[PDB]
Amino acid sequence: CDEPLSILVRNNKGRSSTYEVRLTQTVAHLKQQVSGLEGVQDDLFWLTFEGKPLEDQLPLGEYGLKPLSTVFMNLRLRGG
Amino acid sequence: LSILVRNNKGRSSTYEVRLTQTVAHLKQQVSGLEGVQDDLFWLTFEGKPLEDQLPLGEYGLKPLSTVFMNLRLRGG
Amino acid sequence: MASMRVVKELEDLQKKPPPYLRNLSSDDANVLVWHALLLPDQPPYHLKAFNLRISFPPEYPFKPPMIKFTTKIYHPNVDENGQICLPIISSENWKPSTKTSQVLEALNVLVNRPNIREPKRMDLADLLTQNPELFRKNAEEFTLRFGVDRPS
Amino acid sequence: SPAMQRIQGARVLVSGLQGLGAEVAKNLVLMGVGSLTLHDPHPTCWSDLAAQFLLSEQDLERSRAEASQELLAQLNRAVQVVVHTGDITEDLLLDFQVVVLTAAKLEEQLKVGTLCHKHGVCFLAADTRGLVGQLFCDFGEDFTVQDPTEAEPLTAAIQHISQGSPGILTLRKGANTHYFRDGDLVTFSGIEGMVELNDCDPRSIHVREDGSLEIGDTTTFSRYLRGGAITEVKRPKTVRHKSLDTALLQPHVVAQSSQEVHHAHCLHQAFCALHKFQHLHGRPPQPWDPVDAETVVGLARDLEPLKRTEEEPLEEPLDEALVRTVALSSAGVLSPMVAMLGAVAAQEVLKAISRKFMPLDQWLYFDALDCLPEDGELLPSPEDCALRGSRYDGQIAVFGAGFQEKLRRQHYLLVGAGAIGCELLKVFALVGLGAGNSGGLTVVDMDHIERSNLSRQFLFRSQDVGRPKAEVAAAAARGLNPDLQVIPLTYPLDPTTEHIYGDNFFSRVDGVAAALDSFQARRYVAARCTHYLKPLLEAGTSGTWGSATVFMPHVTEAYRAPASAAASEDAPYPVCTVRYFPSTAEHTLQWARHEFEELFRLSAETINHHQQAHTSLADMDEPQTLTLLKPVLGVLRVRPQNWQDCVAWALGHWKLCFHYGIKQLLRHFPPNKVLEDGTPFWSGPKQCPQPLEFDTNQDTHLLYVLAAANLYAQMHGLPGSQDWTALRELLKLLPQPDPQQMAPIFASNLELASASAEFGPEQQKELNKALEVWSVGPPLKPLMFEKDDDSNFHVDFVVAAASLRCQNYGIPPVNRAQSKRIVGQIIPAIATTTAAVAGLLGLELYKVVSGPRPRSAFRHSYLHLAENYLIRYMPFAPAIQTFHHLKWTSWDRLKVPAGQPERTLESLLAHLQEQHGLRVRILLHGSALLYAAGWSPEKQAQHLPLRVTELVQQLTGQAPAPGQRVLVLELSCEGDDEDTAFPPLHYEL
Ligand SMILES: *OP(=O)(O)OC[C@H]1O[C@@H](n2cnc3c(N)ncnc32)[C@H](O)[C@@H]1O
């Protein structure tokens, strides 16, 4: 898998931004990239794909990400 | 009859405060024996607000109770 | 818990104490407060020493430690009560990665080179900018009248 | 605001006011729908009391609509709830805007759906059959939404638009650089200067590399003076929905994956089979009856294959097991599932009414069959599920009487009684959690009910304001279920109250449900539950977001709080970075709040008490406060009695606090003439302060003036009322009162450069005697600041001050969302998402009560109603950490017995090193160090012989009270790192 793919990450405010990640990169790398881009601490949110959350230590290639695949970002909620 | 008092300044134990008199009159003695004004920090008795003109002895202070306080306001 | 990290940091720091810090110790009753002696290496502050207290909030390192100058120090960046405004300590720049050694280094730098941009005492900055010599006189007088016994 | 104007004028129709219809109607009434119309002429039975909270036992053999109308009307007095006892006709459906058919027959669904789609009326058809739901919404052929996303329009700061003809514009570097897109409309709200570009038509933009932003033709307009705020305009989207009789054949289901779509198709087939069975045999299938399940699955087998996607080949058949399981447990209606589906349906109704958010794309199926016993367990029998006239008949028809007894033996805990707490209390009361002589309940909450709370609350009435929240919630819960025993507690679950909620208290509880509003509270409650090994149910909502999680000990991963947010909750933001460098309007409002606190609160306790107690102006920072308080109003050599309704007492403060000071700092420290490091490089970073002209046409500056005047009149008892239409002429009659007091406001009394305390003892004595004179007067009680009173414009004062200061500093003004982001009328909760998370928590409670279940049975839920987003995923396994021989999880702990005689510290260390094979480098109880390997040998020889309890008593100064079962102290080891965390050591006494 020499060719990196471009995926879309959905912000909580309905906005999608194109990223550039490798399937060998762990979810920690993508989480740090989106944390830096969106200005949110990487421990305040978690990102999911196809209805199931993504673990930090596993590589993105385990979850079967296709090019132009939307990965949702879910915040941790405070009010109640 | 004793009341356990702990302060964030350092080591603290039972003070001269007695439940017979309101803490408003005890403000002078606690300020004299602490050296720091009560205006800096607000006392939180077991998660309950406290006021200078509010006698706390009628709110059910069990013997050998506890008192807590935290740093308040901005430093600057 | 913050206390584990604080004890580890203090134990590591005692092995190779910074040259400007000595007799740095914490009471076993509450290991979240540090007492240390600051030794500036730039006149007029080099005549005496300075004692400061480092207080770690319970949620360290996600909240910066609180630093207060227990002794009376004449400085534009230090209020009378002793609180200091370090760039690292401020929440807009604090990061959990920065250990307390960097904070102490920045404090020493700020003591040697004051942050004239944003002082906690405006009149001191005005006096320093308009007449540095009078500031030198007053600072020397204050550090002689209140300076703690400086060791060697 | 415009959306809420349509809701109050809308009219909806709810049919079949069973458990689901009652939930939908309650959510609609709480949200504020202007006029409902309940329609259900059937009498109340026993089978619907397990899910409907408006019908009691005494309401049997009575029409459900009429019985529910009383409680629904008393729920909110602004909603005109009426009951329609006739029959549904075309002229009736013409009037309403939305109709909802909850648990209505397929014939009625098709008839009403065709009639409503013919007349352009939004239609919803929700239905719950046991543990599987169904929602269908059809909003006409041409329905246009106006706010497609739950997000504010984008805002950015512009700095340079000099380049013209392609309309190149530059803006500050950040996320807003890439936030904007190409195919979007952008509207300039309005800035000082460039009247050509203000209030113009929206202009599409083009994003170019290196920050270039193409606006278009702007050279012919005015010259660019100063940058300002730029906002976005949302593009309305038109959505088309197929009619129900057409959408049955091609179900366009909402799902997150292909597997979920196939599951929803199978559920749709099962529901169609159930409807056909009820059409044939005239009765719903019997509870857990094998013959009726076989009949339903046979109907599904011969059901027309065209019900699925005709063009897509039937690669796999429908699940026989899924259809059979749905048929078996389809004879009951449950409170949690009703709550969840009614929340979703009411959200869809609000979407249709207010034309906000993206409407659900036709079908949505919710599967919650995991709450049934595992495949290896004993499923309920038909005789077990036999109805016996109890209020829980609908729940027994799904689970059985033994599960009801298991539910009622439980003794639970509910930390917090807010919105989610009240909804969970309703779910517990209806379900029957501890509604017996062996069980019970506990509600832990400290706060008191206020007006701003009960606006969208369920259990709180108008006359309950000021009473304890826990007590009122307990009374309401006892009212819902008479058998339920609720024990309200006022002491918060806080580390200062670990003596009340100790081992003796936590021994009785069987579980904990947390409905808290902060991350620190959640972290503490999760820590307590982990310490005592109790199941924990945690929920949290924000807007239309929502989560619902269960943390079973040794099963699912322990709670991991976002420590960054927990720390940021209590934020001592430094004033050192807000006095001169306001980055955003948040800094401006923070500074405004800080100055309000400094001037209106701290002055009361220092004007008299501080001077009369001790100290003076020499040994305290008093002179600055006295200088800012004494001459701002005016001495007049007499007692101050002037009314605040005057120009001088407000415009003088406005000019002093916002013009004189900034002018003084500009003339003292010019941005281009700062003497820093000899030669300045970046003096005046990104901001050049400049006071604005006194433009009386702008009414924003008068808002702050009137707010300050009214606040002073309220706090000092000065007369004042709503003279908005009477005092304007007087206010504008004195446009220039500044020169009349030039000398007092110039510099103290006599100063040129102020030298070094040039005022001297002569002025200090005058200041002291002025303070002594002013110290005589009526007492000023230190009344706490109340943000609930919006009528007196408290938050308006802060907002106006922030807006004027940010305009002074060239910062974009505060918007409505920015204002609501802070304690100035913080964002309230929404009834729909609260009910949804409470229903998911009840579904999890079913499994928690059911007993030993694997991790695969439990599910964590996360939903977003504004975009039809919902996920239910099994939680992660415990994170196993390793260190040599020792391996542990987040629940594991070390227990070491102290023995009949208390072991010494050396004995404890030897026992640890032998039993677990680890060498203790640091061992501390709480924040008191007990042993360190780096200690000098004399100190170790001093500490080791002492007993551990004796050592703790010597150090902390307090002996342990009787009942201290365990001393919990943490430890470290040699050769590890700071990443590892050893399990807490429970030193058993
Ligand atoms: O509706 P809501 O989201 O505001 O509910 C939160 C409720 O939780 C109470 N609360 C908050 N924190 C605690 C603690 N530590 N202990 C007990 N109750 C607590 C609030 O009263 C609030 O209503």
Residue numbers in the entry:
A (entry chain B): 78 to 157
B (entry chain D): 82 to 157
C (entry chain C): 2 to 153
D (entry chain A): 24 to 1012
Quote the study on this structure.
ISG15 is a ubiquitin-like protein that is activated by an E1 enzyme (Uba7) and transferred to a cognate E2 enzyme (UBE2L6) to form a UBE2L6-ISG15 intermediate that functions with E3 ligases that catalyze conjugation of ISG15 to target proteins. E1 occupies the apex of the Ub/Ubl conjugation cascade where it performs two main functions: (1) specific activation of Ub/Ubl in a two-step process that results in the formation of a thioester bond between Ub/Ubl and an E1 catalytic cysteine (adenylation and thioester bond formation) and (2) recruitment of cognate E2 enzymes followed by transfer of Ub/Ubl to an E2 catalytic cysteine (thioester transfer).
Previous studies in the Ub system have shown that although the single-loaded E1-E2-Ub(t) complex is capable of catalyzing thioester transfer, that double-loaded E1 is significantly more efficient at E2 recruitment and catalysis. To generate a mimetic of double-loaded Uba7-UBE2L6-ISG15(t)/ISG15(a) complex, free ISG15 and ATP/Mg2+ were mixed with purified singly-loaded Uba7-UBE2L6-ISG15(t) which allowed binding of ISG15 to the adenylation active site and adenylation of its C-terminal glycine, thus incorporating the ISG15 adenylate (ISG15(a)) into the complex. Two reconstructions of the Uba7-UBE2L6-ISG15(t)/ISG15(a) complex were subsequently isolated, which we refer to as Form 1 and Form 2, with overall nominal resolutions of 3.38 and 3.21 Å, respectively (masked at 0.143 FSC). Globally, the Uba7-UBE2L6-ISG15(t)/ISG15(a) complex exhibits a conserved architecture in both forms of the complex with the AAD, IAD, and FCCH of Uba7 engaging ISG15(a) and UBE2L6 sandwiched between the UFD and SCCH of Uba7. Cryo-EM density linking Gly157 of the CTD of ISG15(t) to UBE2L6 L121K and linking UBE2L6 Cys86 and Uba7 Cys599 are clearly visible and only slight structural rearrangements would place the relevant atoms in position for catalysis, validating our strategy for trapping the complex.
